[PDB]
Subunit: 301 residues, 2 copies
């Protein structure tokens, strides 16, 4: 009954991690059914990562180019019987179906949404943590060299939604990766040139959730009777580095649980961005946008 | 690079979780070999929790009083064939041995040490997070009603150190539990009465680690030539709600890597205690003390 960074139990997804090796290069892959997903830059030699030619590289491969070992749990015999390139991912086909494939889906996450990351090295889970997809389509993770192919996901019921496969580091503590459709979040290129990122923003709905959590724990000094409408807050947001606020039923439950209307918190957010004055809020003298409405509902029940 | 709140993968420990039911009370238990560990207040009924007689509650039990079900993973029912009390924990014996018992130890952690927690409800793992054993022998986590028996651990190679089993809430967001020798952390009582908690302190050595992580991630604005000695800082600490700084080799690797001495960050902590004056350090506006030197070394350099 505090507000902490919380991840899904990782057991489910650990049972799907494998190591993919191609020549002298190695990284992680995700083994679902008869498929192993991994980043395509496993085909690329270190010196050529500046300007790879993936179309060339793909051609020069046979199935015997790809080596897949399973280290965690039950071992280890995966023969690659096919290989395809899908955007910034490779799609390897293997002769054995993962007996431990969860019920799963492949939905792309949106800015502000949270997901769990299983950080792996050489096909071995080493740690798990949770992030939110930034409005500029980066995440703030904890990745060293060799973590490519680490998997990000969410869990509703026993259905895993795989939403992220790690690719690269754009700057200090700034990362991105692929959705399992093969597209890179934020359209960054999987080559090692410096690329510019768009400006970041506060996730408005996540700040509202956080303010609700502060109220639910007795910190409500910022609540006034004043209101800003959603439509009016969103005009303001455009020019002050906040995202468009979009209401959800998860926000609505917090409004009911506390007696404070969304529009009062939208007004407070406008004030708090001018300054906290004193003044702390679970505090912190700055806005928190890394907890979702769902986060706050499940941890402060 | 990047520094996040990082937990161990929980697959190992998930396979060990079970539900223990006794009368009307239900919570989580930990299943190792032929033993299921759970908090003993599962014997105490709804209202008697104000103050219970645990020696009495124990005698009024047989093995049939206890029901253990494994819900997640490899399904099972486990018959209880013995029962004992040890401190604040029951030690239940079951007929089937856990076929996925990890290599493990039972060690008690000291204040400032971090560990992973697997939060469970009704024998089902729902989330994992990392905590530090606070100087006042509480932990700050997310434990709702029904999470007693949730388990905390550190992992070293294949060996899991089990160091915590959740017991109770105290103040808001303030929790405590048992080591697996049965002793409650900070001598608290498993009882719905109120007990006095010592004041919290900042874990100075973790704050230093966090500041080194800042420097290593390109955030060094708080670094000045000025220095406070360890001895001097520790006198200051007593008066200002900080722990005694004790250096380790792990802190030293960070001093070597950044070129910034410990004594420079001791002086910076004294200046940052007052306040960050509108700036932030790794996205925070207050000192962070739940990143340990070992944790920072592992995330930033992959080292021990």
């Amino acid at each position: 009954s505090g507000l902490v960074k919380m991840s899904h139990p990782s057991g489910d997804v650990e049972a799907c991690m494998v190591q993919v090796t191609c020549g002298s290069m190695t990284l992680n892959g995700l083994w679902l059914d008869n498929t192993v997903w991994c980043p395509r830059h496993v085909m690329c030699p270190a010196d050529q990562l500046s300007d790879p030619n993936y179309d060339a590289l793909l051609i020069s491969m046979t199935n015997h180019s790809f080596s897949v070992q399973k280290h965690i749990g039950a071992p280890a015999n995966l023969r690659v019987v096919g290989h395809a390139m899908q955007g910034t991912l490779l799609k390897l086909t293997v002769d054995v179906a993962n007996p431990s494939t969860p019920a799963y889906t492949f939905t792309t996450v949106k800015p502000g949404a949270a997901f769990s990351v299983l950080a792996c090295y050489n096909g071995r889970p080493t740690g798990t943590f949770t992030v939110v997809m930034r409005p500029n389509y980066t995440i703030k993770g904890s990745f060293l060299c060799g973590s490519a192919g680490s998997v990000g996901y969410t869990k509703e019921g026993s259905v895993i939604n795989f939403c992220y496969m790690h690719q690269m580091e754009l700057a200090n503590g700034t990362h991105t990766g692929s959705a399992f459709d093969g597209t890179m979040y934020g359209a960054f290129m999987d080559k090692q040139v410096h690329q510019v990122q768009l400006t970041d923003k506060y996730c408005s709905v996540n700040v509202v959730a956080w303010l609700y959590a502060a109220i639910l724990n007795g910190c409500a000094w910022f609540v006034k009777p004043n209101r800003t409408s959603v439509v009016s807050f969103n005009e303001w947001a455009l020019a002050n580095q906040f995202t468009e606020f979009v209401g959800t039923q998860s926000v609505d439950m917090l409004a009911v649980k506390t007696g404070v209307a969304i529009e009062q918190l939208l007004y407070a957010i406008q004030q708090l961005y001018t300054g906290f004055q004193g003044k702390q809020i679970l505090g912190s003298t700055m806005l928190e946008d890394e907890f979702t409405p769902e986060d706050v509902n499940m941890q402060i029940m």
